[PDB]
Structures are given as C-alpha cells and as structure tokens.
Design a protein around this ligand. Structure first.
Ligand SMILES: CC[C@]1(O)C[C@@H]2CN(CCc3c([nH]c4ccccc34)[C@@](C(=O)OC)(c3cc4c(cc3OC)N(C)[C@@H]3[C@]45CCN4CC=C[C@@](CC)(C[C@@]36OC(=O)N(CCCl)C6=O)[C@H]45)C2)C1
Ligand SMILES: [Ca+2]
Ligand SMILES: [Ca+2]
Ligand SMILES: [Ca+2]
Ligand SMILES: [Ca+2]
Length: 144
C-alpha cells in the first residue's frame, strides 16, 4: 500500500493538470500545463501524449493512467528542458534561485513550504552554491 502522504503527493501532482477537478485530464488541460512550462504543443501532439497512456481508451487521462505516465525522455527532450529552465530562471542569470523556484511552483499551482523549497534545492544542488544551474535542473527534472 501507499502512505497517505504518497497518495497526497500524487493527488497534488494530478490536481496541477486536472484544473477543473472533474477527475480527468483533457488535451485542453494538458496543453495549458505544457504551455506554462514553455512548450507549444499542437492539439494532435497532446492527443498523442494522452494516447500513449490511455489504457481505457476514453481519450483522456485518469488517475491510474497519470501514475503510469509519471513512472515513464522523448518528452523531457533537450528542447523541452531548456524551455522549462527558462520558465524557472526568471531573471535569466543562468541560475534558478530558491526565490525563483518557489515563485514558479506557486504560479504552476504547487504550494511549497520553506522546508520543501530548501530540501528541493539541497537535493538538486551538486556544487553547493545554493542555486540550480541547467545541468542540475536536468537531473532534477529527470530524477527517479
Ligand atoms: C522538461 C519538462 C517537464 O515537463 C518538467 C516536469 C517533469 N517532466 C514531465 C511532466 C510532469 C510533471 N509532473 C508530472 C506528473 C506526472 C506525469 C508527468 C509529469 C512536472 C509538472 O509540470 O508538474 C505539474 C514536474 C515534475 C516533477 C517536478 C517538477 C515538475 O514541474 C512542476 N519535480 C520537482 C519532481 C517531478 C520531476 C521528477 N519527478 C519524477 C517523479 C516524480 C515527480 C512527480 C510528482 C516528483 C517531483 O518532486 C517533487 O518534490 N515534486 C513536487 C514539488 Cl514540485 C515533484 O513533482 C516528478 C513537469 C518534464
Ligand atoms: Ca479535468
Ligand atoms: Ca483514459
Ligand atoms: Ca535566476
Ligand atoms: Ca548549484
């Protein structure tokens, strides 16, 4: 079984995509999340993304399909991660600061405590400057 904290983290993640809270993720919803991350997918591209994990074949992503999508770098290519790094690196100085990380996560719909932002940074920060450079960001986004 999961812990409830695990389930909660999964629900939070899902909630970021399922904006209207009807329990499914549409191409519309997937598209607004991808765009928020600096991408510009086509309707057809979004539908393909959904198709890959659409096990019940209803055209949208439900919770369990979302979990499988989560567990599975075609998406998360270099283009996509550079675009995402840009979103996070708000002043364009080449480093994601704690302030920038927190801000952006909040913008995306995630609400992080100071401890969580701290930990996120610390677990990503290889060279110990308290900031996340591009290569660190890559590892952080493709972790697990
Ligand atoms: C390079 C472009 C990119 O879109 C960038 C992200 C990942 N991916 C694929 C999309 C994605 C994100 N979240 C998902 C959940 C399920 C399926 C796909 C996704 C995606 C997103 O947009 O969230 C809505 C994402 C995923 C992760 C993320 C941040 C993040 O952006 C907000 N982390 C800090 C990780 C993580 C990335 C690494 N990891 C693999 C396994 C689990 C988690 C998923 C919950 C754990 C993570 O760690 C963590 O503490 N949290 C919560 C605090 Cl934020 C996380 O979300 C994800 C967007 C590539
Ligand atoms: Ca929905
Ligand atoms: Ca489905
Ligand atoms: Ca910066
Ligand atoms: Ca660093």
């Amino acid at each position: 079984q999961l812990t409830e904290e695990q389930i909660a983290e999964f629900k939070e993640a899902f909630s970021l995509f399922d904006k209207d809270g009807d329990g499914t993720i549409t191409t519309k919803e997937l598209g607004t999340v991808m765009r928020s991350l600096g991408q510009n997918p086509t309707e057809a591209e979004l539908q393909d993304m959904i198709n890959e994990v659409d096990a019940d074949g209803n055209g949208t992503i439900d919770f369990p399909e979302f979990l499988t999508m989560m567990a599975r770098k075609d998406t998360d290519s270099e283009e996509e991660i550079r675009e995402a790094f840009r979103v996070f690196d708000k002043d364009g100085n080449g480093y994601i600061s704690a302030a920038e990380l927190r801000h952006v996560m909040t913008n995306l719909g995630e609400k992080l405590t100071d401890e969580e932002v701290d930990e996120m940074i610390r677990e990503a920060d290889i060279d110990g400057d308290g900031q996340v450079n591009y290569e660190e960001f890559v590892q952080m986004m493709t972790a697990k």
